[PDB]
């Protein structure tokens, strides 16, 4: 996260760290959506252009964390993966269309002050809140600058951007399964997600029921925090039928 701040304790209790077993390193962010299911970006797990193809036994999920590097004894919980599910139409060849994956945990995780699931949006919450200018919140342990890494989880609030501005900022083909967010050059404030924040959640707090909803997944961008560029996020609601099919069939 570029130009964010340190998270408060328990501020993002759905934030998950995807962790490589060997060598031991951070791979991606992710989010907790129930006691047994974690949501992430498909490119965190499968990206053939970079020879990336992780299997279940390669990875762990770490939940309840604040510090990036420390083993947070008596606070974090570490879970093994039963199965990875990647969207069947994830487009790794072109533009990361449908950049979404689910991971089923081997055993359910106990919730705590530090571990708690985020909601997934219904159609009406998505329609009401996914509007240009409305702000969401991104969190992660990724890079602090394009070109280092934070001591603790970082947070930044960012406005959703009008679709024509998103389209006009890049040569990559945008789809309805994506949205973009960030400040415009004239707006003064700045901030972005970055490498290492991939797969983490873009969340909004509903003013109707005071619950946090995951509207997006950190997906892609060109550089980090560049003027005139925006971060792109997987549109969770647009892909929710697939999420529900997986959880209903395999949960």
């Amino acid at each position: 996260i570029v130009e964010g701040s340190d998270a408060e304790i328990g501020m993002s209790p759905w934030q998950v760290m995807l962790f490589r077993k060997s060598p031991q390193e951070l791979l991606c962010g992710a989010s907790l959506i129930s006691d047994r299911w974690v949501l992430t970006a498909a490119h965190c797990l499968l990206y053939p252009p970079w020879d990336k193809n992780f299997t279940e036994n390669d990875l762990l999920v770490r939940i309840g964390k604040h510090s990036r590097t420390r083993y947070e004894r008596n606070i974090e919980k570490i879970s093994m993966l039963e199965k990875i599910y990647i969207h069947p139409r994830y487009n790794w060849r072109e533009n990361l269309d449908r950049d979404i994956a689910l991971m089923k945990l081997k055993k359910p995780v106990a919730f705590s002050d530090y571990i708690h699931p985020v909601c997934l949006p219904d159609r009406e919450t998505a329609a009401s809140l996914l509007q240009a200018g409305y702000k969401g919140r991104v969190t992660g342990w990724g890079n602090l600058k394009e070109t280092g890494q934070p001591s603790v989880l970082q947070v930044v609030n960012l406005p959703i951007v009008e679709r024509p501005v998103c389209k006009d900022s890049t040569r990559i083909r945008i789809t309805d399964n994506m949205f973009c967010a960030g400040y415009k050059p004239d707006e003064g404030k700045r901030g972005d997600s970055c490498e290492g924040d991939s797969g983490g959640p873009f969340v909004m707090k509903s003013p109707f029921n005071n619950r946090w909803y995951q509207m997006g997944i950190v997906s892609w961008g060109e550089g980090c925090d560049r003027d005139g560029k925006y971060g792109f996020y997987t549109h969770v609601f647009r892909l929710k039928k697939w999420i529900q099919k997986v959880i209903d069939q395999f949960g």
Binding site: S5, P117, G133, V155, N157, M204, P207, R211, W212
Partner: peptide, 28 residues
Amino acid sequence: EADCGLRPLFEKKSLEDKTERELLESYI
């Protein structure tokens, strides 16, 4: 889940985090 999206250290205690008001002020 029925309790999703309600943080134990914030919503469940009626405590606000330091920047959530910025989000609310944008929902216009």
